[PDB]
Design a protein around this ligand. Structure first.
Ligand code: ACO
Length: 170
């Protein structure tokens, strides 16, 4: 119906909770399903409806050249604040409300071409945050390698919930 380059003129677009709407819905839903399948999750953790219902922020990377220059969304990164009880390196149990990575996916055939990096760098600047100051919801092996090799985040501080944080968090 619309070319994506017309809906999203920027290479990386930011959506809050405000999502023409049916086309935007389809794009986000398909990407969310792809991410959850990649992670062997029982259901999508990212969808258009969930975006509308939550206070999350979704970054979408568009390859403007694809589909005869009409554009295709090739990856997304979803972040949001979560209230968390966390343990520091000495075992002090601290209440915190960090910005968290909640979902993150680049189309499998397009991985390892820097798209994840572009999304993550854009978000850090946009949110005015450094990677060590964030929490990570159940990060996968691929994402942990990404964080170690590109952002020097290694040897996380063990938590009892499913969130991961690194030394510089504290
Ligand atoms: C909290 C959560 O969101 S948990 C869910 C995380 N998402 C997933 O597991 C979904 C499946 N995985 C993905 O979609 C991707 O692997 C992502 C989004 C994590 C990374 O996106 P990509 O576009 O592939 O990352 P990008 O190309 O920018 O990689 C940057 C660096 O990260 C490291 N890296 C990325 N993938 C890997 C990997 N599979 N193995 C080892 N290192 C990797 C490399 O150092 C890479 O640089 P190099 O390619 O020059 O070696």
């Amino acid at each position: 119906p619309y070319d994506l380059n017309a809906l999203f003129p920027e290479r990386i677009s930011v959506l809050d909770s405000n999502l023409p709407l049916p086309q935007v819905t389809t794009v986000i839903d398909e990407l969310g399903k792809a991410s959850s399948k990649a992670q062997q999750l029982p259901a999508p953790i990212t969808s258009a409806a969930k975006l509308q219902a939550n206070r999350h922020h979704l970054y979408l990377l568009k390859d403007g050249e694809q589909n005869g220059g009409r554009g295709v969304i090739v990856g997304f990164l979803k972040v949001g604040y979560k209230k968390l009880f966390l343990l520091d390196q000495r075992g002090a149990h601290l209440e915190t409300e960090p910005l968290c990575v909640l979902d993150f996916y680049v189309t499998e055939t397009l991985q390892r071409h820097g798209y994840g990096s572009e999304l993550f760098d854009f978000m850090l600047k946009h949110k005015q945050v450094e990677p060590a100051q964030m929490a990570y919801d159940r990060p996968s092996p691929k994402f942990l390698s990404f964080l170690e090799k590109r952002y020097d985040l290694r040897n996380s501080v063990p938590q009892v919930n499913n969130f991961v944080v690194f030394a510089g968090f504290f």
